[PDB]
């Protein structure tokens, strides 16, 4: 079959080691990357906010919040995400590029609920979610992108957000 075929990198702008890298906010079994306060337009051009999710335990809910275009006036005018089918389709490193790949084929036993919580599990609804299996044998890393670097508000520019989900063997 087929589920898309694109190619991105960690950037598409500038910076490579000036990346603001932080861990996800982990509450019990919920690991959250919330970009609703990281991607607003700022004077120092486009920053890159890299949220690192490290899964070392069974049945972790990974939740990702991306500010919706138009949710506030202006600040998210040109916001777009990496994989449009973000829960079911992810990005994987191939040397220097990130290409699309089905998540269920990457990790066996992925429980993708079609209804996140009364809404459609898709970045169009602002939030995606997926639960990791009880057993993972090989370390697997996949990526998500919430890019607001195109949005221009004032004399500053928005930021590009990166989620790195590192599923460790557990």
């Amino acid at each position, epitope marked *: 079959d087929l589920s898309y075929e694109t190619t991105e990198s960690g950037d598409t702008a500038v910076s490579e080691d000036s990346y*603001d890298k932080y*861990a996800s*906010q*982990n509450t019990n079994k919920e690991y959250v990357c*919330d970009f609703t306060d*990281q991607l*607003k337009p700022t*004077e120092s051009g486009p920053k890159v906010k890299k949220c690192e999710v490290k899964v070392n335990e069974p049945l972790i809910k990974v939740k990702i919040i991306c500010p919706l275009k138009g949710s506030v006036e202006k600040l998210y005018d040109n916001i777009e995400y990496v994989p449009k089918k973000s829960p079911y389709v992810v990005l994987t490193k191939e040397e220097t590029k990130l290409k699309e790949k089905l998540l269920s084929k990457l990790i066996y036993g992925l429980l993708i609920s079609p209804t996140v919580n009364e809404k459609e599990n898709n970045f169009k609804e602002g939030v995606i979610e997926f639960t990791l299996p009880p057993v993972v044998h090989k370390a697997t890393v996949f990526y998500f992108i919430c890019d607001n670097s195109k949005t221009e508000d004032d004399n500053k520019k928005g930021n590009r957000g990166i989620v790195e989900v590192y599923v460790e063997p557990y």
Partner: antibody, heavy 119, light 109 residues
Framework: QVQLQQPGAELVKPGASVQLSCKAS????????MHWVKQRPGQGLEWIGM????????NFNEKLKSKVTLTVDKSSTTAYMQLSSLTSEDAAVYYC????????????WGTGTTVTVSS | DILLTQSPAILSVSPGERVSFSCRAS??????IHWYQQKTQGSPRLLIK???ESISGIPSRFSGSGAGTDFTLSINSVESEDIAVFYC??????????FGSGTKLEIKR
């Protein structure tokens, strides 16, 4: 020319209410949140709440919401904080401050009203 | 709950040295930290927005940094006019905001 003007003092009797005022000037009032910050004599800043002038949308820290009411008069670009049933614990300096849109920092702060609760 | 910790309560340098105030969050909050300066009997003054962005009229010797949990406001070549209390503020829990307990900066000649 941005200005947030606050009265110097308010002497309140125990159990009475007080109306604090924050007169804004020199900017577009309807484009900014107006926050209220409490500072007891020699201590730290304590965020209380905020209000947006257009929709009258208010957000409070639920620990102090029971006693606070926030109000805006768009005609005179003035923000008000109502405080009820005051006690000695309510005596402090109360600053107003503004924040633009969803940029959640306080760039312009008011002069501050020293509130005293005594008979 | 997100909790901020500023240590120590009192920091002392020398006129010209490098000062740095620590603001630690109890959970990772990206770059949702903001710094303020309050001088004696004065209103707080915004020094740094979103961890490391300079403000319009702040001297260039005021710099912040940090992502996630540990944030640092630094002053290279500290003057004596910088004597005040420094508060950090988090916005990750918007629309609820909190301040750190503040770190006082003194100078000893």
């Amino acid at each position: 020319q941005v200005q947030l003007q606050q009265p110097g003092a308010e002497l309140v009797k125990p159990g009475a209410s007080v109306q604090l005022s924050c007169k804004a000037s020199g900017y577009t009032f309807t484009s900014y949140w107006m926050h209220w910050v409490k500072q007891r004599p020699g201590q730290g800043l304590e965020w209380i709440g905020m209000i947006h002038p257009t929709n009258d949308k208010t957000n409070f820290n639920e620990k102090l919401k029971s006693k606070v009411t926030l109000t805006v008069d768009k005609s005179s670009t003035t923000a008000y904080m109502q405080l009820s049933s005051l006690t000695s614990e309510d005596a402090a300096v109360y600053y107003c401050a503004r924040s633009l849109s969803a940029y959640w920092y306080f760039d312009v702060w008011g002069t501050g009203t020293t509130v005293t609760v005594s008979s | 709950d997100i909790l901020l910790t500023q240590s120590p309560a009192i920091l002392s340098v020398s006129p010209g040295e490098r000062v740095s105030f620590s603001c630690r969050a109890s959970q990772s909050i990206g770059t949702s930290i903001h710094w303020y300066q309050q001088k004696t009997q004065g209103s707080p003054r915004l020094l740094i927005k979103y961890s490391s962005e300079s403000i319009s009229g702040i001297p260039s010797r005021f710099s912040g940094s940090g992502a996630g949990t540990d944030f640092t406001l630094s002053i290279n070549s500290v003057e004596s006019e910088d004597i005040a209390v420094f508060y950090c503020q988090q916005s990750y829990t918007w629309p609820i905001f909190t301040f750190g307990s503040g770190t006082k900066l003194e100078i000893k000649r």
